[PDB]
Amino acid sequence: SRELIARYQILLAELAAIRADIAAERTGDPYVRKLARELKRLAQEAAEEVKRDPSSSDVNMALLLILLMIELAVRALEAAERTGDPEVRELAAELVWLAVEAAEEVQRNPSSSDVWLALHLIMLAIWAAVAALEAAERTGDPEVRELARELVRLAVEAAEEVQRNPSSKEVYMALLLILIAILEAVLSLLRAERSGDPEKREKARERVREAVERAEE
Amino acid sequence: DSRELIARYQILLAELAAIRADIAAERTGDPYVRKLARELKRLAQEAAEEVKRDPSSSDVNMALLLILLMIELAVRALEAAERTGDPEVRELAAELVWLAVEAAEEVQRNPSSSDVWLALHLIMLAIWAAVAALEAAERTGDPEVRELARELVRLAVEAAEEVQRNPSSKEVYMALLLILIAILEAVLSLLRAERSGDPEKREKARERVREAVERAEE
């Protein structure tokens, strides 16, 4: 039972390390390259912690989230590259750097629920950020592209505060508020994608503008 | 409340999952994939609606979160299984997604049951493994490997049906987990040979996948 889960998680970790390695080889950006090798290091260290001592559920939960964050973060860096936009790449990279820092904290303190939750919210931030930046590249409207950048910049700043103060509930909630704004913006761009008029274009723009103003509070 | 913020967030996640499912329903080109993507859309809308009517039940909120995440995964899995161009890859992924839809309905009907939640969760993990196997096999163009990967996934479909239909059996749960372990060992063998240079590594990868199928079938 527990033996089976441990075998399974070691395989997931070995696979996450290869996925990170592959992305490290494919990328054209030195920051992405550095981070993909860090994600690879983390998956390897996880496989080796589970190997030595599979019997701690704290450690198993800590290492499982790190593995899932890696899988997500690698796909997130690859998707952010697929846009060809250097600023998209750099924003995704700053969020992945924060996730790696929050993973290190989880590794050092696997019994802390606040530290685990901080990494977990940063993984959700990465997911939202990549959705926003991908939706914005499909529009080719320059103002929408800039507003989506503005939203993601706010998320980076708020994810840094969470990473550095995982037990603050107001800081945690400030990030959640920005993710809500980001998804409201994504949902407005998608509903415009599947519609007709440039009336819908300016409608979508106004909703994204309103989302950024909400986040800015 | 913090709960109020989480509920707002999950309603948006659900709205977004419904659109992703719709988009995949429109693009596909296989009628079974189309039918399933519309079911994944329906499940996301019903989840948005249940959180709206009552955000206060932690069982309901957990039941609905897993469904949304399964939808996100299942849609990417059907899309990835179509990108192979192979009608059998398509059909195997579809059978697993159909099982996940059935297991989601059971979760909706019984959100307080831990066994039923875990059954949906293991089937979502099965979908993840199955697509990794079928994608790695498409990379190789070796006909035997592609056939062994199909055999592994067919075993997972059969074992996922048994989990779906008997969520409280521990032996059946473990039987699926054992198959997923075999599938990941096979994926790991294919990717490690995809990297290497030694052209004997193809036959080495093949023999490790053969051994993985043997373990699964036990």
Residue numbers in the entry:
A (entry chain B): 2 to 218
B (entry chain A): 1 to 218
Question: What does the paper behind this entry write?
Answer:
To investigate the photophysics of special pairs independently of the complexities of native photosynthetic proteins, and as a first step toward creating synthetic photosystems for new energy conversion technologies, we designed C2-symmetric proteins that hold two chlorophyll molecules in closely juxtaposed arrangements. For Chl dimer protein scaffolds, we chose hyperstable C2-symmetric repeat protein dimers containing symmetric pockets with tunable sizes and geometries. In this dimeric repeat protein architecture, the hydrophobic core is independent of the small molecule-binding site, enabling full customization for binding with little impact on the overall protein structure. We describe de novo-designed proteins that hold Chl dimers in precisely defined, closely juxtaposed geometries.
The X-ray crystal structure of SP1 was solved in the ZnPPaM-bound state to 2.0 Å resolution, revealing a special pair geometry closely matching that of purple photosynthetic bacteria. The r.m.s.d. between the ZnPPaM dimer in the SP1 crystal structure and its design model is 0.25 Å. Hydrogen bonds to the ring E ketone group, which has been shown to be important for modulating special pair redox potentials, form with Gln10 in both ZnPPaM molecules, in agreement with the design model. We obtained crystal structures of two holo-state designs: the first, SP1, reproduces the binding geometry of the native purple bacterial reaction center special pair with sub-Ångstrom precision, and the second, SP2, has a distinct geometry with the Chl molecules closer together. Calculations on the SP1−ZnPPaM dimer crystal structure yielded a lower excitonic coupling of 87 cm−1. Experimental low-temperature spectra of SP1−ZnPPaM in 40% glycerol showed only a modest broadening of the SP1−ZnPPaM dimer fluorescence emission band compared with the monomer, consistent with weaker excitonic coupling. SP1 exhibits weaker excitonic coupling than SP2 and the BChl special pair of purple photosynthetic bacteria, despite its close structural similarity to the latter. We found that the signs of the CD Cotton effects predicted from the crystal structures of SP1 and SP2 were consistent with the experimental signs in the Qy region.
